[PDB]
DNA sequence: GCGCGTACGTGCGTTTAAGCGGTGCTAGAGCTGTCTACGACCAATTGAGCGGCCTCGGCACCGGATTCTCAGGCCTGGCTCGCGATAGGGTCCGA
C-alpha cells in the first residue's frame, strides 16, 4: 500500500481508517462502552503542511462499536450524526507521504494516533 | 489495546498395543508346634549429674574516619544530509 500505518491506543477510541487523499477521517470505539468525545480535537498533520484543527460540538458521544467518519468539503458526503459528519470548513484533509491523524480530547491530551508513512 | 505467528485444537486414517480369555505353577503368604534367648523387675551403689556462686570475657554499644555508593553535567563518536563524478543505455557509422 506504500503507506505504513502505526496504531497506538491508551483509551477506548482507536483511529480505524485514514484516507490517503484526505477525503475522510475514520475512528473506531473498540471498547464495550460508549465514549463521550464532547469538544475533542482532531489535529491533522500532512508532513510539513500547517496543522488543520477540527473541533467537535460541545456535547458529542460515540456509542460503543459504532463508526463516525469525518468527511471533508471536497468529498461531497452528507452529515448524519452520530455516524456521519462533514467538515465543510476544510476542502480536504490534505495529502503527503507523512500523514498523521491525532485524536485530542477536551483536556488537550493525545489518546489515539495513526500515522501514514510513505517511503 | 495494539498486533502476530506459531503452537495447540480439530479430524482423521493407522495400527498396535490395551483389553479379554484362558492356562500352570510354584513362590511365597499364611498358619501351626517348639523352645530359647529376651526382657521385666526389684535391692544396693554410687557417682552421674543436677543446682547455686565467681569470674571475665565474648560480645554489645557510642564516636568518626574511610571506603563505598548514588547522582548529575559536558565532550566525542554514531548517525545522517547533501553535491558532483565514471558505469550503463543507447546511437550510429564502418563491411
UniProtKB/Swiss-Prot annotation:
<feature type="modified residue" description="Phosphothreonine">
    <location>
        <position position="78"/>
    </location>
</feature>
<feature type="modified residue" description="Phosphoserine">
    <location>
        <position position="36"/>
    </location>
</feature>
<feature type="modified residue" description="Phosphoserine">
    <location>
        <position position="31"/>
    </location>
</feature>
<comment type="similarity">
    <text>Belongs to the intermediate filament family.</text>
</comment>
<feature type="modified residue" description="Phosphothreonine">
    <location>
        <position position="83"/>
    </location>
</feature>
<feature type="modified residue" description="Phosphothreonine">
    <location>
        <position position="69"/>
    </location>
</feature>
<feature type="modified residue" description="N6-acetyllysine">
    <location>
        <position position="23"/>
    </location>
</feature>
<feature type="domain" description="LTD">
    <location>
        <begin position="1"/>
        <end position="118"/>
    </location>
</feature>
<protein>
    <recommendedName>
        <fullName>Prelamin-A/C</fullName>
    </recommendedName>
</protein>
<feature type="modified residue" description="Phosphoserine">
    <location>
        <position position="106"/>
    </location>
</feature>
<feature type="modified residue" description="Phosphoserine">
    <location>
        <position position="4"/>
    </location>
</feature>
<feature type="cross-link" description="Glycyl lysine isopeptide (Lys-Gly) (interchain with G-Cter in SUMO2); alternate">
    <location>
        <position position="23"/>
    </location>
</feature>
<feature type="cross-link" description="Glycyl lysine isopeptide (Lys-Gly) (interchain with G-Cter in SUMO2)">
    <location>
        <position position="59"/>
    </location>
</feature>
<comment type="subunit">
    <text>Homodimer of lamin A and lamin C. Lamin dimers then assemble into dimeric head-to-tail polymers. Ultimately, two head-to-tail polymers assemble laterally into a protofilament with a uniformly shaped rod of 3.5 nm in diameter. Interacts with lamin-associated polypeptides IA, IB and TMPO-alpha, RB1 and with emerin. Interacts with SREBF1, SREBF2, SUN2 and TMEM43. Interacts with TMEM201. Proteolytically processed isoform A interacts with NARF. Interacts with SUN1. Interacts with MLIP. Interacts with DMPK; may regulate nuclear envelope stability.</text>
</comment>
<feature type="modified residue" description="Phosphoserine">
    <location>
        <position position="119"/>
    </location>
</feature>
<feature type="cross-link" description="Glycyl lysine isopeptide (Lys-Gly) (interchain with G-Cter in SUMO2)">
    <location>
        <position position="43"/>
    </location>
</feature>
<feature type="modified residue" description="Phosphoserine">
    <location>
        <position position="2"/>
    </location>
</feature>
<feature type="modified residue" description="N6-acetyllysine">
    <location>
        <position position="59"/>
    </location>
</feature>
<feature type="modified residue" description="N6-acetyllysine">
    <location>
        <position position="30"/>
    </location>
</feature>
<feature type="compositionally biased region" description="Polar residues">
    <location>
        <begin position="1"/>
        <end position="8"/>
    </location>
</feature>
